[PDB]
């Protein structure tokens, strides 16, 4: 939600970021929000000029009792002085709805930082890191998105793909899952799943070596936490609900790590407030019905370990910095080359403000896939949810900022383990800071 | 789903388990499907007469055209046979509907050593194990359900629930919970949330190294699955049904595990299939909204490792045996004091021949708990889910029969820790077999 000050205070500065974003359908509401709250105010302004009318009529009376008081008109006056002041207020009540309507329904002010575009191939490359392995066959288009910038190798075989691994590697049943619930769901098999939970550890222990408290949140929750979170149009798009009950599949822990203290005004002496949660995500995936990479890449259903802030608006940027490069240490732990990148306005989203994007190599697609994702929401979510915090239990409570970042989300995680570590034969060799959580040093194909 | 075949050849034989379950209202079905059973046979009949009835005078009726053909009789005829094949081919549909109705709300057979019983306090007790710390005021009790068989000591001071002792510990926040979801919802916090994931990696390494093959399944369903697992009860009382769609949350892995391979003819050369399954489980608990144990012990959502097994028919019973022995043994080295009960009729529920609980003795609350499960289903969810085998390609499939049991739910496994190795001063100690997966020995009280 928009704060309706901001917008009061620049109209073009609104418009003009509305237009980066590619929103241009909703800058004509910039105009409508302003001269609703124009009325909203000329309106209030009249009650008052009324309430003090209530206040002469009234001492009139009075002086005119111990006169001939022919108040009879006076109390006339009076009760149509009643009647306005309800009829403005209620009008002024639904001239808020209408304005709380838009505020809603508008992206966050995005930073100045970030390059304008239209779409993902605007987004731009800030940074690399790794020895890519690359088939002879993609060299180019390697280049091209490595800007040269990355250090590589050349492969003599050709990569395969995450899917056929998981294949020879007895990793997975996707026919059966089909059966059972569709497509795009799932079973994941054998080392695969030890994988899996090993990514969620290793994750979940170097966050909480840096401070974080974990924590396991509700899988379901309220309809406000979810459109306290994002925009309305993900209810269409991405998040499931439950027959018969006010309850939603959470798409990310970041929800229920947002709801969790909806409605509180936080003592700025805990600031930082800093959270590492675990939980499946769920996804309708809705924009698409199957595009390309046909495993486990877009899922229903995956595991995601969250980092999630709340912060001084002070001091957001520098934890957006901060979270974006704790997830990038544990990728390089696990060896896998990425780049990570500037999400441009078009591509943005509407609640961030800014943010990074980890796209990993992939060896075996020829290409850098997004494998996590940094958002600093400044006040986006808190003026939704309301979460305000005080220093000075006398003043005024100011709102927080909420920033989030994927720690791992081992469905990608491990297609990039599993492209990236995966030798001619099929046999996939598994980082060594896993191996205190997987027992076995790789994964050898079946026969 | 009961066999036609065996409701035919011995109606008695179910009409006495069914009042022994004391399902004394569907005993009439037997009579009922027997009826309908006839008429749908002899119709049946009665079509495949008429059908070559009519051939016979397909063949007369053009035999008389090289005569004197007053086939103007034959044509009335072979006119009123096809109106009464349709008629009865409605009537066969109609009758199936009416047949398989009953078919598949019928209790499986339950295995002559099942106990009769109204509800769960005539569930049996048959072995105990461990030695449980018991408060002086529980005295009574303990040694009523203990019947006198079971090691103890007597403490001074009353042990606490586990829900306080979550608070204490600072493992859980139930407030925001019911603020984000509602009642019955949880965050658990801290090293009650490693706790939580060393118990599923606990579980699995047990299994595994008894050569179950491990999963992660869809934690969404298509509906058969669901009708395929149980009665149809469950669907009002237990199972959340995303809207719009043909998907429905699992309540347990045992679900995804038996619709794993419905429709399928195993080769027998496999059998035993061992699966040991791992994901989150969520119930409506419907029959409550407030009871007793306020923690998480009765919750919407839990972590839960199961064991599934597709085997021989003349192999489920020796498994039931050797699952319900797993569990034990992961309890006996997480070392919770217990007694596995033998469930009798009016516990038994409608998909198992015979079942065992293990029922952890609890110290706060002062009583053993369901903490485990074991069941044999024989072929009630095979008949169902369409699940057979063969041993040559040659001969007639039949049915295999199915097995599920715990393994360890998360949740009560918490609380039985929590409540059998608390202290005076309400730190918990661990388990040693778990310390290679929570790195900490106990954990203790917070400010
Ligand atoms: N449909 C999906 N299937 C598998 N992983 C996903 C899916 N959607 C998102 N993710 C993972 O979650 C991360 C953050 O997503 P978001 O919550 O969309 O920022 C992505 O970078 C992926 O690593
Ligand atoms: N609503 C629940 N909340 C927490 N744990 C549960 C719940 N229902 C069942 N369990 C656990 O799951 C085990 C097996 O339950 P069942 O799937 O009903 O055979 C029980 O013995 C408990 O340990």
Redo the contacts between chains.
Sequence with gaps: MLDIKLIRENPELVKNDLIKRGELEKVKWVDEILKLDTEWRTKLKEINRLRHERNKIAVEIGKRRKKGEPVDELLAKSREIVKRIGELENEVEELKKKIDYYLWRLPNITHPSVPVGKDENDNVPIRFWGKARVWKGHLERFLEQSQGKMEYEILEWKPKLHVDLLEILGGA?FA??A????SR??????EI??L??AL??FA?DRLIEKGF??????????RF?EEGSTSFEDFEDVI????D???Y?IPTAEH?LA?????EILDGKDLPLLYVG?S?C?RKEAGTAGKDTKGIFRV??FHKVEQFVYSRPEESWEWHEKIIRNAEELFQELEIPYRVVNICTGDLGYVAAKKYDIEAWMPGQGKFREVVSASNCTDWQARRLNIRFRDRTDEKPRYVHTLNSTAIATSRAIVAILENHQEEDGTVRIPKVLWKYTGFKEIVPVE
């Design positions: 049943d059966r899952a059966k059972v619930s569709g769901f799932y079973y994941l098999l054998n799943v030890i899996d939970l969620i550890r979940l408290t974990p924590v396991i949140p509700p899988y379901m929750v309220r936490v499931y609900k439950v027959e009950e006010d309850l599949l229920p709801g969790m203290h909806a409605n675990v499946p769920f229903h259903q």
